Coordinates of C-alpha atoms and ligand atoms in Angstrom, one line a residue:
Chain A
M19 CA -30.8 58.0 -2.2
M20 CA -33.8 56.9 -4.2
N21 CA -35.1 53.4 -4.1
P22 CA -32.9 51.4 -6.6
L23 CA -34.2 49.7 -9.7
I24 CA -33.2 46.1 -10.2
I25 CA -33.1 45.0 -13.8
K26 CA -33.0 41.2 -14.1
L27 CA -31.5 39.8 -17.2
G28 CA -32.0 36.2 -18.4
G29 CA -32.7 34.1 -21.5
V30 CA -30.6 33.8 -24.6
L31 CA -29.9 37.5 -24.4
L32 CA -26.6 36.7 -22.9
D33 CA -25.6 35.0 -26.2
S34 CA -26.4 37.9 -28.6
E35 CA -23.8 40.7 -29.1
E36 CA -26.3 42.8 -31.0
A37 CA -28.9 42.4 -28.1
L38 CA -26.3 43.2 -25.5
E39 CA -25.2 46.3 -27.4
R40 CA -28.7 47.6 -27.8
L41 CA -29.3 46.8 -24.0
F42 CA -26.3 48.6 -22.7
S43 CA -26.8 51.5 -25.0
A44 CA -30.3 51.9 -23.3
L45 CA -28.8 51.4 -19.8
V46 CA -26.2 54.2 -20.4
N47 CA -29.0 56.4 -21.7
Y48 CA -31.1 55.7 -18.6
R49 CA -28.3 56.1 -16.2
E50 CA -27.3 59.5 -17.7
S51 CA -30.9 60.7 -17.5
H52 CA -32.2 59.3 -14.2
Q53 CA -31.0 59.7 -10.6
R54 CA -32.5 56.4 -9.5
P55 CA -29.5 54.1 -9.0
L56 CA -29.4 50.8 -11.0
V57 CA -28.6 47.3 -10.0
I58 CA -28.3 44.3 -12.4
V59 CA -29.2 40.7 -11.3
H60 CA -28.6 38.0 -13.9
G61 CA -29.2 34.4 -14.6
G62 CA -27.6 32.5 -17.5
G63 CA -29.2 29.1 -17.8
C64 CA -28.2 29.2 -21.4
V65 CA -24.5 29.6 -20.7
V66 CA -24.9 26.6 -18.3
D67 CA -26.8 24.5 -20.8
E68 CA -24.2 25.1 -23.5
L69 CA -21.3 24.2 -21.1
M70 CA -23.2 21.1 -20.0
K71 CA -23.6 19.7 -23.5
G72 CA -19.8 20.5 -23.9
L73 CA -19.4 18.0 -21.1
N74 CA -22.2 15.8 -22.2
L75 CA -24.1 16.2 -19.0
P76 CA -27.9 16.1 -18.8
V77 CA -30.0 19.1 -17.7
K78 CA -33.0 18.1 -15.5
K79 CA -35.3 20.8 -14.1
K80 CA -37.8 19.9 -11.3
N81 CA -40.6 22.4 -10.8
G82 CA -38.8 25.0 -12.9
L83 CA -35.5 24.6 -11.0
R84 CA -32.2 23.0 -12.2
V85 CA -31.4 19.9 -10.2
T86 CA -27.8 20.7 -9.2
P87 CA -25.7 17.7 -8.1
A88 CA -22.6 18.2 -5.9
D89 CA -20.5 17.1 -8.9
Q90 CA -21.9 19.9 -11.0
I91 CA -22.2 23.0 -8.6
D92 CA -18.6 24.1 -9.3
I93 CA -19.0 24.0 -13.1
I94 CA -22.4 25.8 -12.8
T95 CA -20.9 28.4 -10.4
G96 CA -18.2 28.9 -13.1
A97 CA -20.7 29.6 -15.9
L98 CA -22.9 31.8 -13.8
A99 CA -20.8 33.5 -11.3
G100 CA -17.8 33.6 -13.6
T101 CA -18.6 33.7 -17.3
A102 CA -22.0 35.3 -17.3
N103 CA -21.1 37.8 -14.6
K104 CA -17.9 38.9 -16.2
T105 CA -19.2 39.0 -19.7
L106 CA -21.7 41.6 -18.4
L107 CA -19.0 43.5 -16.5
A108 CA -17.1 43.6 -19.9
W109 CA -20.0 45.2 -21.7
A110 CA -20.4 47.7 -18.8
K111 CA -16.6 48.6 -19.2
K112 CA -17.0 48.9 -23.0
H113 CA -19.7 51.5 -22.2
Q114 CA -17.7 53.5 -19.6
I115 CA -19.9 52.2 -16.8
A116 CA -18.2 51.7 -13.5
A117 CA -19.6 48.3 -12.5
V118 CA -18.8 45.8 -9.7
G119 CA -19.5 42.2 -10.0
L120 CA -21.0 40.4 -6.9
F121 CA -22.6 37.1 -6.1
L122 CA -25.4 36.6 -3.5
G123 CA -22.9 36.0 -0.7
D124 CA -21.0 39.3 -1.0
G125 CA -22.0 41.4 2.0
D126 CA -24.6 38.7 2.8
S127 CA -26.8 40.6 0.4
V128 CA -29.1 37.6 0.0
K129 CA -29.2 34.7 2.5
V130 CA -29.4 31.2 1.0
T131 CA -30.1 27.8 2.5
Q132 CA -30.6 24.4 0.7
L133 CA -34.1 24.3 -0.7
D134 CA -34.6 20.6 -1.2
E135 CA -32.3 17.7 -0.8
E136 CA -34.0 16.3 -4.0
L137 CA -32.7 19.3 -5.9
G138 CA -29.1 19.1 -4.6
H139 CA -27.3 22.4 -4.4
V140 CA -30.2 24.6 -5.2
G141 CA -30.7 27.5 -2.8
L142 CA -33.7 29.1 -1.3
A143 CA -33.1 32.8 -1.5
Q144 CA -34.3 35.2 1.2
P145 CA -33.6 38.9 2.1
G146 CA -30.2 39.7 3.4
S147 CA -28.2 42.9 4.3
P148 CA -28.4 45.9 2.0
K149 CA -25.3 47.6 3.6
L150 CA -22.7 46.7 1.0
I151 CA -24.8 47.3 -2.1
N152 CA -26.2 50.6 -0.7
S153 CA -22.5 51.8 -0.1
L154 CA -21.5 50.8 -3.6
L155 CA -24.6 52.6 -5.0
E156 CA -23.8 55.7 -3.0
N157 CA -20.3 55.7 -4.3
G158 CA -21.6 55.5 -7.8
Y159 CA -21.0 51.9 -9.0
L160 CA -23.4 49.7 -10.8
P161 CA -23.6 46.3 -9.0
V162 CA -24.0 43.4 -11.3
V163 CA -25.1 40.3 -9.3
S164 CA -25.1 36.7 -10.2
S165 CA -27.5 34.1 -8.8
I166 CA -24.9 31.9 -7.1
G167 CA -25.0 32.1 -3.4
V168 CA -23.5 30.4 -0.3
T169 CA -24.9 28.9 2.9
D170 CA -23.5 29.9 6.3
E171 CA -21.7 26.6 6.4
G172 CA -19.9 27.3 3.2
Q173 CA -21.8 25.3 0.6
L174 CA -22.2 26.9 -2.9
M175 CA -25.9 27.2 -4.0
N176 CA -27.5 27.6 -7.4
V177 CA -30.4 30.0 -7.1
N178 CA -33.0 30.6 -9.7
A179 CA -32.2 34.3 -11.0
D180 CA -35.9 35.4 -10.7
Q181 CA -36.0 34.3 -7.1
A182 CA -32.6 35.9 -6.5
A183 CA -33.7 39.1 -8.0
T184 CA -36.9 39.2 -5.9
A185 CA -35.0 38.5 -2.6
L186 CA -32.5 41.3 -3.5
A187 CA -35.4 43.6 -4.3
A188 CA -36.8 43.1 -0.8
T189 CA -33.4 43.5 0.8
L190 CA -32.8 46.9 -1.0
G191 CA -36.5 48.1 -1.1
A192 CA -35.9 48.2 -4.9
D193 CA -38.3 48.5 -7.8
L194 CA -38.0 45.4 -10.1
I195 CA -38.1 44.5 -13.8
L196 CA -37.7 40.9 -15.0
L197 CA -36.5 40.9 -18.6
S198 CA -36.8 37.7 -20.6
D199 CA -36.8 36.2 -24.2
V200 CA -40.6 36.8 -24.5
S201 CA -42.9 39.9 -24.1
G202 CA -44.3 39.0 -20.7
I203 CA -46.5 36.0 -19.8
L204 CA -48.3 34.6 -22.8
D205 CA -51.8 33.0 -22.8
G206 CA -52.9 29.7 -24.4
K207 CA -52.7 31.4 -27.8
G208 CA -49.2 32.7 -27.3
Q209 CA -50.5 36.3 -26.8
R210 CA -49.1 38.8 -24.3
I211 CA -51.1 39.1 -21.0
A212 CA -51.1 42.8 -20.1
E213 CA -51.8 42.5 -16.3
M214 CA -51.5 39.7 -13.8
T215 CA -52.9 39.1 -10.3
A216 CA -52.4 36.2 -7.9
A217 CA -55.9 34.9 -8.8
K218 CA -55.3 35.0 -12.6
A219 CA -51.9 33.4 -12.1
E220 CA -53.5 30.5 -10.2
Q221 CA -56.1 30.1 -12.9
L222 CA -53.6 30.0 -15.7
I223 CA -51.4 27.6 -13.8
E224 CA -54.4 25.3 -13.1
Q225 CA -55.1 25.3 -16.9
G226 CA -51.5 24.5 -17.8
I227 CA -51.0 27.8 -19.7
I228 CA -48.2 28.9 -17.4
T229 CA -45.6 26.2 -17.0
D230 CA -41.8 25.4 -16.3
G231 CA -39.7 28.4 -15.5
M232 CA -42.6 30.7 -16.0
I233 CA -44.4 29.4 -12.9
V234 CA -41.2 30.2 -11.0
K235 CA -41.0 33.6 -12.7
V236 CA -44.6 34.7 -12.0
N237 CA -44.5 33.4 -8.5
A238 CA -41.2 35.4 -7.8
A239 CA -42.8 38.5 -9.3
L240 CA -46.0 38.2 -7.3
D241 CA -43.9 37.7 -4.2
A242 CA -41.9 41.0 -5.0
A243 CA -45.1 42.9 -5.7
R244 CA -46.8 42.0 -2.4
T245 CA -43.6 42.4 -0.4
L246 CA -42.7 45.9 -1.9
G247 CA -46.4 46.9 -2.3
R248 CA -45.3 47.9 -5.8
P249 CA -46.1 46.6 -9.4
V250 CA -43.5 44.3 -11.0
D251 CA -43.0 44.0 -14.7
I252 CA -42.0 41.0 -16.8
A253 CA -40.9 42.1 -20.2
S254 CA -38.6 41.4 -23.2
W255 CA -35.1 42.6 -23.9
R256 CA -35.3 41.7 -27.6
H257 CA -36.8 44.9 -29.1
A258 CA -34.4 47.8 -29.0
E259 CA -36.9 50.4 -29.8
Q260 CA -38.9 49.5 -26.6
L261 CA -36.0 49.5 -24.2
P262 CA -36.0 53.2 -23.4
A263 CA -39.8 53.4 -22.5
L264 CA -39.6 50.1 -20.7
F265 CA -36.8 51.3 -18.3
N266 CA -38.9 54.5 -17.8
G267 CA -41.9 52.6 -16.3
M268 CA -43.9 52.1 -19.5
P269 CA -45.7 48.7 -19.3
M270 CA -44.2 46.6 -22.2
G271 CA -45.1 43.1 -21.0
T272 CA -46.9 41.7 -18.1
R273 CA -47.5 44.0 -15.1
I274 CA -47.9 42.1 -11.8
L275 CA -50.3 43.8 -9.5
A276 CA -49.9 43.1 -5.8
Chain B
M28 CA -5.2 52.6 7.7
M29 CA -2.0 50.5 7.5
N30 CA -0.5 49.2 4.2
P31 CA -2.5 46.2 3.3
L32 CA -0.9 42.7 3.0
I33 CA -1.8 40.8 -0.2
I34 CA -1.6 37.1 0.1
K35 CA -1.5 35.4 -3.3
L36 CA -2.8 31.9 -3.5
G37 CA -2.0 29.4 -6.4
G38 CA -1.0 25.9 -7.1
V39 CA -2.9 22.7 -6.2
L40 CA -3.9 24.2 -2.9
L41 CA -7.2 25.2 -4.4
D42 CA -7.9 21.4 -4.7
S43 CA -7.2 20.4 -1.1
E44 CA -10.0 20.7 1.5
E45 CA -7.5 20.0 4.3
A46 CA -5.1 22.5 3.0
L47 CA -7.8 25.2 2.6
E48 CA -9.0 24.5 6.1
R49 CA -5.6 24.9 7.6
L50 CA -5.1 28.0 5.6
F51 CA -8.3 29.7 6.5
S52 CA -7.8 28.8 10.2
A53 CA -4.5 30.6 9.9
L54 CA -6.1 33.6 8.1
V55 CA -8.7 34.0 10.8
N56 CA -6.1 33.8 13.5
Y57 CA -4.0 36.5 11.7
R58 CA -7.0 38.8 11.1
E59 CA -8.1 38.6 14.7
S60 CA -4.7 39.4 15.9
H61 CA -3.4 42.0 13.5
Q62 CA -4.7 45.4 12.4
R63 CA -3.1 45.3 9.0
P64 CA -6.0 44.7 6.5
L65 CA -5.7 41.7 4.3
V66 CA -6.4 41.1 0.6
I67 CA -6.4 37.9 -1.3
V68 CA -5.4 37.5 -5.0
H69 CA -5.6 34.1 -6.5
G70 CA -4.9 32.0 -9.5
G71 CA -6.1 28.6 -10.2
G72 CA -4.4 27.2 -13.2
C73 CA -5.3 23.7 -11.8
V74 CA -8.9 24.4 -11.9
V75 CA -8.4 25.4 -15.5
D76 CA -6.3 22.5 -16.5
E77 CA -8.9 20.1 -15.0
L78 CA -11.7 21.8 -16.8
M79 CA -9.7 21.8 -20.1
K80 CA -9.2 18.0 -19.9
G81 CA -12.9 17.7 -19.2
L82 CA -13.3 19.4 -22.7
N83 CA -10.2 17.7 -24.2
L84 CA -8.6 20.9 -25.0
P85 CA -4.8 21.2 -25.0
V86 CA -2.9 23.7 -22.6
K87 CA 0.0 25.4 -24.1
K88 CA 2.1 27.8 -22.1
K89 CA 4.5 30.3 -23.8
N90 CA 7.2 31.9 -21.6
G91 CA 5.3 30.8 -18.6
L92 CA 1.9 32.2 -19.7
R93 CA -1.1 30.3 -20.9
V94 CA -1.9 30.8 -24.6
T95 CA -5.6 31.9 -24.3
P96 CA -7.5 31.6 -27.6
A97 CA -10.7 33.6 -28.1
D98 CA -12.6 30.3 -28.1
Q99 CA -11.3 29.6 -24.6
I100 CA -11.3 32.9 -22.7
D101 CA -15.0 32.5 -21.6
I102 CA -14.3 29.0 -20.2
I103 CA -11.1 30.1 -18.5
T104 CA -12.9 33.2 -17.1
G105 CA -15.5 30.8 -15.6
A106 CA -13.0 28.5 -13.9
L107 CA -10.9 31.4 -12.5
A108 CA -13.3 34.4 -12.0
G109 CA -16.2 32.0 -11.1
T110 CA -15.3 28.6 -9.6
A111 CA -11.9 29.5 -8.0
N112 CA -13.1 32.9 -6.7
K113 CA -16.3 31.6 -5.3
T114 CA -14.7 28.5 -3.7
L115 CA -12.5 30.9 -1.7
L116 CA -15.5 33.1 -0.9
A117 CA -17.3 29.9 0.4
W118 CA -14.3 29.0 2.7
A119 CA -14.3 32.6 4.0
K120 CA -18.1 32.4 4.8
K121 CA -17.5 29.1 6.6
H122 CA -15.0 30.9 8.8
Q123 CA -17.2 33.9 9.4
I124 CA -15.1 36.2 7.3
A125 CA -16.9 39.0 5.5
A126 CA -15.3 38.7 2.1
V127 CA -16.1 40.3 -1.2
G128 CA -15.1 38.7 -4.5
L129 CA -13.7 40.9 -7.2
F130 CA -11.8 40.5 -10.5
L131 CA -9.2 43.0 -11.9
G132 CA -11.7 45.2 -13.6
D133 CA -13.8 46.0 -10.6
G134 CA -13.1 49.6 -9.7
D135 CA -10.4 49.6 -12.3
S136 CA -8.3 48.1 -9.6
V137 CA -5.7 46.8 -12.1
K138 CA -5.5 48.0 -15.7
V139 CA -5.1 45.4 -18.4
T140 CA -4.2 45.4 -22.1
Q141 CA -3.4 42.6 -24.5
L142 CA 0.2 41.6 -23.9
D143 CA 0.9 39.7 -27.1
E144 CA -1.2 38.8 -30.1
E145 CA 0.6 35.4 -30.0
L146 CA -0.8 34.7 -26.6
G147 CA -4.4 35.5 -27.4
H148 CA -6.4 36.9 -24.6
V149 CA -3.6 37.1 -22.1
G150 CA -3.4 40.5 -20.3
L151 CA -0.5 42.7 -19.3
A152 CA -1.4 43.9 -15.8
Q153 CA -0.4 47.4 -14.6
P154 CA -1.4 49.6 -11.6
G155 CA -4.9 50.9 -11.4
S156 CA -7.1 52.7 -8.9
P157 CA -7.0 51.8 -5.2
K158 CA -10.3 53.6 -4.4
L159 CA -12.7 50.7 -4.4
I160 CA -10.5 48.2 -2.6
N161 CA -9.5 50.9 0.0
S162 CA -13.1 51.6 0.7
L163 CA -13.9 48.0 1.1
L164 CA -10.9 47.5 3.5
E165 CA -12.0 50.6 5.5
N166 CA -15.5 49.1 5.8
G167 CA -14.0 45.8 7.1
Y168 CA -14.3 43.4 4.2
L169 CA -11.8 41.0 2.9
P170 CA -11.3 41.5 -0.9
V171 CA -10.7 38.1 -2.7
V172 CA -9.5 39.1 -6.2
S173 CA -9.2 36.8 -9.3
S174 CA -6.7 37.3 -12.1
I175 CA -9.2 37.8 -14.9
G176 CA -9.2 41.4 -16.1
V177 CA -10.9 43.4 -18.9
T178 CA -9.6 46.0 -21.5
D179 CA -11.1 49.4 -21.9
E180 CA -12.6 48.0 -25.1
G181 CA -14.5 45.3 -23.1
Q182 CA -12.3 42.3 -24.0
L183 CA -11.7 39.8 -21.2
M184 CA -8.2 38.9 -20.4
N185 CA -6.4 36.1 -18.6
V186 CA -3.6 37.5 -16.4
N187 CA -1.0 35.4 -14.7
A188 CA -1.9 35.6 -11.0
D189 CA 1.6 36.5 -9.8
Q190 CA 1.7 39.4 -12.2
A191 CA -1.8 40.5 -11.1
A192 CA -0.8 40.3 -7.5
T193 CA 2.2 42.5 -8.1
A194 CA 0.2 45.1 -10.0
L195 CA -2.4 45.2 -7.2
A196 CA 0.4 45.5 -4.7
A197 CA 1.7 48.6 -6.5
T198 CA -1.9 50.0 -6.7
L199 CA -2.5 49.6 -2.9
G200 CA 1.0 50.1 -1.8
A201 CA 0.6 46.7 -0.2
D202 CA 3.1 44.2 1.3
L203 CA 3.1 41.0 -0.7
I204 CA 3.4 37.2 -0.1
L205 CA 3.3 34.7 -3.0
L206 CA 2.1 31.3 -1.7
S207 CA 2.8 28.2 -3.9
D208 CA 3.1 24.5 -3.9
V209 CA 6.8 24.7 -3.1
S210 CA 8.9 26.2 -0.3
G211 CA 10.2 29.1 -2.4
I212 CA 12.6 29.0 -5.3
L213 CA 14.6 25.8 -5.5
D214 CA 18.1 25.5 -6.8
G215 CA 19.5 22.8 -9.2
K216 CA 19.4 20.2 -6.4
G217 CA 15.8 21.0 -5.5
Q218 CA 16.8 22.8 -2.3
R219 CA 15.1 26.1 -1.1
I220 CA 17.0 29.3 -1.8
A221 CA 16.7 31.6 1.2
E222 CA 17.3 34.9 -0.4
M223 CA 17.1 36.3 -4.0
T224 CA 18.3 39.4 -5.8
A225 CA 17.9 40.4 -9.5
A226 CA 21.6 39.4 -10.1
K227 CA 21.1 35.9 -8.6
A228 CA 17.8 35.4 -10.5
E229 CA 19.5 36.3 -13.8
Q230 CA 22.2 33.8 -13.0
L231 CA 19.8 30.9 -12.2
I232 CA 17.7 31.7 -15.2
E233 CA 20.8 31.6 -17.5
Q234 CA 21.7 28.2 -15.9
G235 CA 18.2 26.8 -16.5
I236 CA 17.5 26.4 -12.8
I237 CA 14.6 28.7 -12.8
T238 CA 12.1 27.9 -15.5
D239 CA 8.5 27.9 -16.7
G240 CA 6.1 29.7 -14.4
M241 CA 8.9 30.2 -11.8
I242 CA 10.6 32.7 -14.2
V243 CA 7.3 34.7 -14.3
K244 CA 6.9 34.3 -10.5
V245 CA 10.4 35.5 -9.6
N246 CA 10.1 38.4 -12.1
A247 CA 6.9 39.4 -10.6
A248 CA 8.3 39.4 -7.1
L249 CA 11.3 41.4 -8.1
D250 CA 9.2 43.9 -9.8
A251 CA 7.1 44.3 -6.7
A252 CA 10.2 44.5 -4.4
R253 CA 11.7 47.4 -6.4
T254 CA 8.4 49.1 -6.9
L255 CA 7.5 49.0 -3.2
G256 CA 11.1 49.3 -1.9
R257 CA 10.1 46.3 0.3
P258 CA 11.0 42.6 0.4
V259 CA 8.6 40.1 -1.1
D260 CA 8.4 36.5 -0.1
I261 CA 7.6 33.3 -2.1
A262 CA 6.6 30.6 0.2
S263 CA 4.5 27.4 0.6
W264 CA 1.0 27.0 1.8
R265 CA 1.4 23.2 2.4
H266 CA 2.8 23.1 6.0
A267 CA 0.1 24.1 8.5
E268 CA 2.5 24.6 11.4
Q269 CA 4.5 27.3 9.3
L270 CA 1.5 29.3 8.3
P271 CA 1.2 31.5 11.5
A272 CA 4.8 32.5 11.6
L273 CA 4.8 33.0 7.8
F274 CA 1.9 35.5 7.8
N275 CA 3.7 37.3 10.7
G276 CA 6.7 38.1 8.5
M277 CA 9.0 35.2 9.3
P278 CA 11.0 34.1 6.1
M279 CA 9.7 30.6 5.3
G280 CA 10.7 30.5 1.6
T281 CA 12.6 32.8 -0.7
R282 CA 12.8 36.4 0.3
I283 CA 13.2 38.7 -2.7
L284 CA 15.4 41.7 -1.9
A285 CA 15.0 44.8 -4.0
Ligands
ADP305 N1 -47.4 31.0 -20.3 C1 -46.1 31.2 -20.6 N2 -45.9 32.5 -21.0 C2 -44.6 32.9 -21.3 N3 -43.5 32.2 -21.3 C3 -43.8 30.8 -20.9 C4 -45.0 30.3 -20.5 N4 -45.0 29.1 -20.1 C5 -43.7 28.8 -20.3 N5 -42.9 29.8 -20.7 C6 -41.5 29.7 -20.9 O1 -40.8 30.4 -19.9 C7 -39.6 31.0 -20.6 C8 -39.0 32.1 -19.7 O2 -38.5 31.6 -18.4 P1 -37.1 30.9 -18.1 O3 -37.0 29.7 -19.1 O4 -37.1 30.6 -16.7 O5 -36.0 31.9 -18.6 P2 -35.5 33.3 -17.9 O6 -36.0 33.4 -16.5 O7 -34.0 33.1 -17.9 O8 -35.9 34.4 -18.9 C9 -40.1 31.4 -22.0 O9 -38.8 31.4 -22.8 C10 -41.0 30.2 -22.3 O10 -40.3 29.2 -23.0
ADP306 N1 13.8 26.7 -9.9 C1 12.5 26.5 -9.6 N2 12.3 26.5 -8.2 C2 10.9 26.3 -7.7 N3 9.8 26.0 -8.5 C3 10.2 25.9 -9.8 C4 11.5 26.1 -10.4 N4 11.5 25.9 -11.7 C5 10.3 25.7 -12.0 N5 9.4 25.6 -10.9 C6 7.9 25.3 -11.1 O1 7.2 26.4 -10.7 C7 6.0 26.0 -10.0 C8 5.3 27.1 -9.3 O2 4.8 28.1 -10.3 P1 3.5 28.0 -11.1 O3 3.5 26.8 -11.8 O4 3.4 29.2 -11.9 O5 2.3 27.9 -10.1 P2 1.6 28.9 -9.0 O6 2.1 30.3 -9.4 O7 0.1 28.8 -9.4 O8 2.0 28.6 -7.6 C9 6.5 24.9 -9.1 O9 5.4 24.0 -8.8 C10 7.6 24.1 -10.0 O10 7.0 23.0 -10.7
NLG307 C1 -31.6 26.6 -9.5 C2 -31.8 27.1 -10.8 O1 -32.7 26.9 -11.5 N1 -31.0 27.9 -11.2 C3 -30.8 28.6 -12.5 C4 -29.9 29.9 -12.4 C5 -29.7 30.7 -13.8 C6 -31.0 31.4 -14.2 O2 -32.0 31.7 -13.6 O3 -30.9 31.4 -15.5 C7 -30.3 27.8 -13.4 O4 -30.6 27.6 -14.6 O5 -29.2 26.9 -13.3
NLG308 C1 -2.0 34.0 -18.6 C2 -2.0 33.1 -17.6 O1 -1.0 32.4 -17.6 N1 -2.8 32.9 -16.8 C3 -2.9 32.0 -15.6 C4 -3.9 32.5 -14.5 C5 -4.1 31.6 -13.3 C6 -2.9 31.4 -12.4 O2 -1.9 32.2 -12.3 O3 -2.9 30.3 -11.9 C7 -3.4 30.8 -16.0 O4 -3.0 29.6 -15.8 O5 -4.4 30.6 -16.9
ALF309 F1 -31.3 33.3 -17.8 AL1 -32.5 32.4 -16.8 F2 -33.6 31.5 -15.9 F3 -32.4 31.1 -18.0 F4 -32.6 33.6 -15.6
ALF310 F1 -2.5 28.8 -9.3 AL1 -1.3 29.5 -10.4 F2 -0.3 30.1 -11.7 F3 -1.3 27.9 -11.1 F4 -1.3 31.1 -9.7
MG311 MG1 -36.0 31.5 -15.1
MG312 MG1 2.1 31.0 -11.7

């Protein structure tokens, strides 16, 4: 079978019915017109932030990662591994797509360990086994994977979805597309940056242009690009008219080179 | 492959580390000493009730089923399909069991439709396709299935775990064990009832002995027993010493006959 294509979904997309409909319409069109098997990895920080306020709990992010206390990992797991994942499975079902929801621990797809005691239950994702997902793909299912993982000792871990997507890409030897609320990485004037290299990323980071979750996003993309020896794109899921060309390889945001 | 055995987990078990440890110890022992493939189906009303109070939302059950408003289905899905499911996946991992988490919609394992507009997003579960789960079992994985499902139109549904377990049993032609906080169905004096028939169940229901979720539980068990033409047991997960014999077919609670 061909190298799969992982489409990572994140941002406020998950909270827009119209955006979800336009996205799945495009997914069906792609699936029915391409032999390359698809895999979806998703985040859902917005679903979490919303649930947190509903509980009046603060949200602190250190170096682009969400501090995840032991007293919050179960709730976060629920919002990400449960609500976010099953919402996407429901849209897949609505569009007659046979999908299967998974989290990083299923089939040890992506191995996770505690990244930093200061972050709590935040996991460091690394390549795992492609056996389960490859079998699902060969059988014609669309794996939809959340970014919650579990350590060999049985501790649930919250993994940044971009890093989770990159680790899965390495595991499956898959092409990768990171979809967000913005059209790629923006410069100091808020304009889209067409191409990105490690050198340029370092420069923009030194200058404070790339910050917060985008530093994590670009670092994950660069990691995937060098690991796969293939370009990785960071693009938007907002514009319906751009979705078809995007999924077909047309650069619509920021293309990470090696 | 042999007919699988579905072990349904529910009650406050999900909130006891000691109980979970004793259970998984017994599961590993069984798996390593029996060729019959295992499948876990789980509920988690307690995880939901706890999350609801955390949001100060009331919990109303009509005829043993939780009224599930549209404004609560996502939160419930998170607690059941996310937290509860992944907690069990974590314990499986801790005991070196290769498990795979699923919800009723994965592989259309169990078909669900809206049961009653008065209940909101509560689903009526019916047999689906055994293809996905059979393939997972043949490949050596332990499917751990939550009771959240999805309609063909893409609407998430909350299904009572006992009914979900029975529908899956029919789908897979599996033996079934329903584990709860009590040692089977109790009589008017709180004593365990060894055997149960449809006639006896009707009698006890008419007399008010069997009420609330137990009416749903016994009706689900009787349905499974007549559909499979096999006895179904309702037993407790509380007593560690009884777990081994229980999983080996020894009647430890209430055995439903036809
Ligand atoms: N230079 C930058 N270019 C583009 N987005 C940036 C930049 N610096 C910070 N961002 C922030 O990064 C966000 C996207 O990353 P993130 O918040 O992690 O969400 P997700 O990964 O779920 O899409 C944008 O919504 C933006 O607010
Ligand atoms: N006659 C009865 N015998 C046993 N349990 C009963 C009876 N009538 C009501 N129950 C209630 O049913 C409960 C078990 O069913 P339920 O609440 O649905 O939980 P679960 O299915 O998650 O184990 C018991 O904890 C008990 O409080
Ligand atoms: C550790 C960590 O930052 N996790 C992410 C996972 C979801 C996502 O990427 O949207 C988080 O917001 O909680
Ligand atoms: C509809 C319905 O009653 N659902 C169950 C599902 C979980 C279980 O059985 O514990 C519920 O409590 O929300
Ligand atoms: F949805 Al995100 F980081 F917020 F992947
Ligand atoms: F855990 Al339950 F009904 F409360 F299956
Ligand atoms: Mg991010
Ligand atoms: Mg019940």
